[PDB]
C-alpha cells in the first residue's frame, strides 16, 4: 500500500533547511545584507520590497542546491530528503511581504532526488499567522495560527501542494505542519482537526502517500490512539540537546546516555512509526543567530539569564576543520549514538544539509570531514544503544 515502508524500513535522511524557507542562522549573510531588522523571511522580504526580494531570494534558491547535492546525499547512504516549504510558495496572502517562485525549485528537487534514488518528504514548514512564533515559520514572535481564517488558508495551501506533488512515487510522505507549538499556545483539539483534514487531502490525491504529523512538542507516545495506521501515519519528533538547560549541561557520555534513554522511553513507546525528523551533531546553542537574530546563547550565559557553561566563539561560526581531533571525535561519538538509537525505531533525518558554517549542524561539512558515517556499518566506536 505504502510508497515507503515506514513500518519496516529505516529512514536515513537529511533536511534542506534554509533553502525554500530562509533562516538567519543557516544563511546569516542574506539577512545581514538587509540590516538589523531583517530577522526572518517576513521582515527580510518586507525590507527589500517585492522586486528586490524576488531577486535576492531567487538567486539563493538557484545557487544553494543542485543535482550534485542530491547525488552526495545518496553517496552518504541516505534514502530520504526532508524539504521545508512555506505556505507563501503556494500564493502569498494579500498584504504578505513574501515572494513566491519556490515551487519551480521544489519541482527540480523532486526530479533530482528521483535521479539519485532518494525519497522526498515535503514539509509544510510555515503556516499563515505562524504556528510556533519561530523565525523558521516565516515570522518570529506571536502564534496567530488558529486565529481568523488562518487554518483554512493553511489547508488551501496544503491542498495545492498535495495536488502538485503526490503524483510522483519520489514523494513518499508529506508533513502537515512543522513544529506546531502546543506549549506555546496551539490548541491540540484544533490541531487534531487540521490533521484529520490533511489526511483527507492526501487521500484525495494518493492514498499510497504517508502522512507525517509533528508531535507538537508533547511526548511522542502521548499521540498514541490518534491515526494509528501502520506505515500510513508517521509521527515526527525533533530531538535536540541545546534548547533545554538539563541537556545542554551534559558531557559527551551523558549526552549519549540521554539519546539512548530517549529512544527507549519515547520512540519505542509510540504505537506508530516515528522518525526523528530533526536532530544534529551540535551539543551547544552557540551557532550564530540560532535562538534568533539579535538573541544570544544559553551556553555562554547570553540567553534568558542562564548561567554560562563555556564560551561560544569556537562553535558559533566556521567549519569543523577548525576544531581539534578530539572535538571531532566526540562529535562523531554523539552522531553515531543517535544513528544507532534512532534506527531502533524508524530512523532519522539530520538537520541540516548545508549552512554558511555552523559547527556540528552541517552534514555536507561533517561528511567531508569524516565526522558523519556513510552507512550503518561505518562505526568508529562501539554501538551505544541496543535492542
Ligand atoms: C527553541 C527551539 C525549540 C526553537 P528554535 O530556536 O529552533 O526556533
Ligand atoms: Na558541539
Amino acid at each position: 500500500a505504502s510508497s515507503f515502508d515506514y513500518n519496516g524500513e529505516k529512514v536515513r535522511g537529511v533536511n534542506l533547511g534554509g533553502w525554500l524557507v530562509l533562516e538567519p542562522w543557516i544563511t546569516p549573510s542574506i539577512f545581514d545584507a538587509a540590516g538589523a531588522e531583517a530577522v526572518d523571511e517576513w521582515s527580510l522580504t518586507k525590507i527589500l520590497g517585492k522586486e528586490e526580494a524576488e531577486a535576492r531570494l531567487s538567486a539563493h534558491w538557484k545557487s544553494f542546491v543542485s543535482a550534485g547535492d542530491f547525488q552526495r546525499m545518496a553517496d552518504a547512504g541516505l534514502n530520504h530528503v526532508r524539504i521545508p516549504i512555506g505556505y507563501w510558495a503556494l500564493g502569498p496572502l494579500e498584504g504578505d511581504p513574501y515572494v513566491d517562485g519556490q515551487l519551480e525549485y521544489l519541482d527540480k528537487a523532486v526530479e533530482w532526488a528521483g535521479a539519485a534514488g532518494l525519497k522526498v518528504l515535503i514539509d509544510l514548514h510555515g503556516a499563515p499567522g505562524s504556528q510556533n512564533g519561530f523565525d523558521n515559520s516565516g515570522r518570529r514572535g506571536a502564534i496567530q495560527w488558529q486565529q481568523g481564517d488562518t487554518v483554512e488558508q493553511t489547508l488551501d495551501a496544503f491542498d495545492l501542494l498535495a495536488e502538485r506533488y503526490l503524483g510522483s512515487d519520489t514523494v513518499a510522505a508529506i508533513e502537515a505542519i512543522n513544529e506546531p507549538n502546543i506549549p506555546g499556545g496551539v490548541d491540540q483539539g484544533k490541531l487534531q482537526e487540521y490533521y484529520g483534514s490533511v489526511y483527507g487531502i492526501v487521500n484525495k490525491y494518493n492514498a499510497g502517500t504517508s502522512v507525517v504529523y509533528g508531535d507538537g512538542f508533547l511526548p511522542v507516545e502521548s499521540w498514541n490512539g490518534f491515526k494509528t495506521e501502520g506505515s500510513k501515519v508517521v509521527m515526527d519528533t525533533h530531538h535536540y540537546h541545546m534548547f533545554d538547560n538539563g541537556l545542554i549541561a551534559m558531557d559527551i557520555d551523558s549526552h549519549i546516555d540521554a539519546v539512548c534513554q530517549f529512544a527507549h522511553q519515547h520512540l519505542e513507546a509510540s504505537d506508530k512509526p516515528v522518525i526523528v525528523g530533526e536532530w544534529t551533531g551540535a551539543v551547544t546553542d552557540c551557532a550564530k543567530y540560532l535562538n534568533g537574530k539579535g538573541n544570544g546563547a544559553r551556553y555562554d550565559g547570553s540567553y534568558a539569564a542562564d548561567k554560562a557553561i563555556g564560551d561560544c566563539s569556537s562553535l558559533a561560526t566556521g567549519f569543523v576543520s577548525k576544531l581539534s581531533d578530539e572535538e571531532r571525535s566526540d562529535m562523531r561519538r554523539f552522531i553515531e549514538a543517535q544513528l544507532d538509537a534512532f534506527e531502533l525505531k524508524s530512523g532519522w533525518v539530520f538537520w541540516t544539509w548545508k549552512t554558511e558554517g555552523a559547527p556540528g549542524w552541517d552534514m555536507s561539512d561533517l561528511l567531508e570531514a569524516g565526522v558523519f558515517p556513510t552507512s550503518p556499518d561505518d562505526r568508529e566506536f562501539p554501538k551505544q544503544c541496543h535492542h
Side-chain angles (χ1 to χ4, degrees):
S2 221
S3 161
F4 180 95
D5 175 16
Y6 291 97
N7 230 355
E9 300 292 338
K10 301 308 173 183
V11 174
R12 300 189 176 95
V14 71
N15 285 272
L16 280 170
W19 178 38
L20 306 181
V21 172
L22 284 75
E23 307 188 27
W25 75 263
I26 304 181
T27 57
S29 71
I30 295 172
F31 291 90
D32 289 355
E37 298 298 318
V39 301
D40 53 27
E41 185 164 342
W42 179 280
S43 57
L44 176 61
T45 58
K46 178 174 231 287
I47 285 160
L48 294 174
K50 289 289 191 153
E51 178 174 8
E52 187 67 12
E54 188 289 341
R56 295 199 193 173
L57 274 65
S58 71
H60 159 81
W61 302 332
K62 180 168 212 185
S63 64
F64 196 67
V65 176
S66 77
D69 287 293
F70 289 87
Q71 188 56 53
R72 291 195 159 72
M73 289 169 194
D75 295 345
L78 305 183
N79 56 44
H80 266 79
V81 193
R82 177 172 178 257
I83 312 185
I85 191 139
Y87 79 83
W88 53 95
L90 299 120
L93 297 169
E94 227 246 321
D96 287 354
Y98 299 123
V99 292
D100 64 3
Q102 299 87 353
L103 297 172
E104 281 68 17
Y105 294 93
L106 183 52
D107 293 346
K108 293 173 185 188
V110 172
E111 181 199 302
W112 293 333
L118 300 169
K119 295 305 194 175
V120 172
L121 163 48
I122 294 179
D123 149 37
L124 178 65
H125 207 81
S130 186
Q131 75 274 17
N132 46 47
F134 305 152
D135 59 7
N136 57 54
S137 71
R139 194 183 189 178
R140 80 167 186 216
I143 297 176
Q144 310 201 263
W145 189 65
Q146 302 182 325
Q147 295 311 312
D149 293 317
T150 56
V151 172
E152 172 181 0
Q153 291 160 349
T154 307
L155 289 165
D156 289 342
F158 190 93
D159 168 72
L160 295 184
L161 192 60
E163 178 166 58
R164 188 169 189 104
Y165 288 112
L166 262 40
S168 171
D169 187 47
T170 294
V171 174
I174 186 164
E175 190 162 4
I177 187 65
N178 184 66
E179 290 188 357
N181 189 351
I182 295 181
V186 168
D187 178 83
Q188 183 163 9
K190 284 182 165 210
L191 178 65
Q192 290 176 12
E193 291 175 28
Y194 171 70
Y195 285 181
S197 294
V198 156
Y199 181 106
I201 290 168
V202 168
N203 281 6
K204 170 170 43 152
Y205 293 112
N206 189 345
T209 308
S210 294
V211 179
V212 180
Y213 298 139
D215 57 22
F217 297 110
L218 303 181
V220 64
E221 73 272 16
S222 81
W223 289 87
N224 276 19
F226 182 82
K227 288 294 207 194
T228 303
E229 299 197 8
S231 286
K232 176 60 184 192
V233 182
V234 180
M235 295 305 300
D236 180 10
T237 198
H238 297 177
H239 185 71
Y240 291 113
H241 287 209
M242 73 282 301
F243 296 125
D244 173 78
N245 287 349
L247 291 167
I248 203 177
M250 291 183 171
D251 63 16
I252 178 61
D253 299 295
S254 294
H255 282 291
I256 289 171
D257 289 341
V259 162
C260 204
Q261 282 182 43
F262 175 71
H264 287 310
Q265 298 188 298
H266 291 293
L267 297 180
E268 288 187 323
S270 174
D271 68 354
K272 286 174 277 290
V274 178
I275 60 170
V276 184
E278 305 178 12
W279 60 282
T280 196
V283 295
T284 85
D285 64 341
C286 288
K288 182 187 279 188
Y289 302 159
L290 185 71
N291 295 124
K293 170 169 161 180
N295 300 139
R298 299 160 186 77
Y299 190 71
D300 66 359
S302 54
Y303 180 92
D306 281 341
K307 303 294 185 120
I309 298 160
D311 180 84
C312 278
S313 47
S314 174
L315 289 172
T317 70
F319 301 94
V320 296
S321 60
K322 79 190 292 186
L323 304 175
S324 75
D325 284 332
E326 184 177 14
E327 286 167 331
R328 283 182 296 271
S329 177
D330 280 352
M331 181 179 291
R332 176 158 177 144
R333 286 177 61 199
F334 179 56
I335 293 166
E336 288 188 3
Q338 289 176 281
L339 294 187
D340 289 328
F342 299 162
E343 292 186 14
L344 294 178
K345 180 56 176 174
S346 315
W348 53 259
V349 186
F350 182 96
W351 188 279
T352 188
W353 174 245
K354 185 182 296 183
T355 73
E356 293 181 356
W361 286 98
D362 181 323
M363 181 185 280
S364 75
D365 178 31
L366 299 184
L367 281 166
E368 184 283 324
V371 172
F372 205 97
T374 58
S375 82
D377 297 311
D378 178 11
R379 295 290 182 279
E380 287 183 6
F381 307 90
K383 199 169 201 284
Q384 291 303 304
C385 201
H386 322 68
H387 283 291

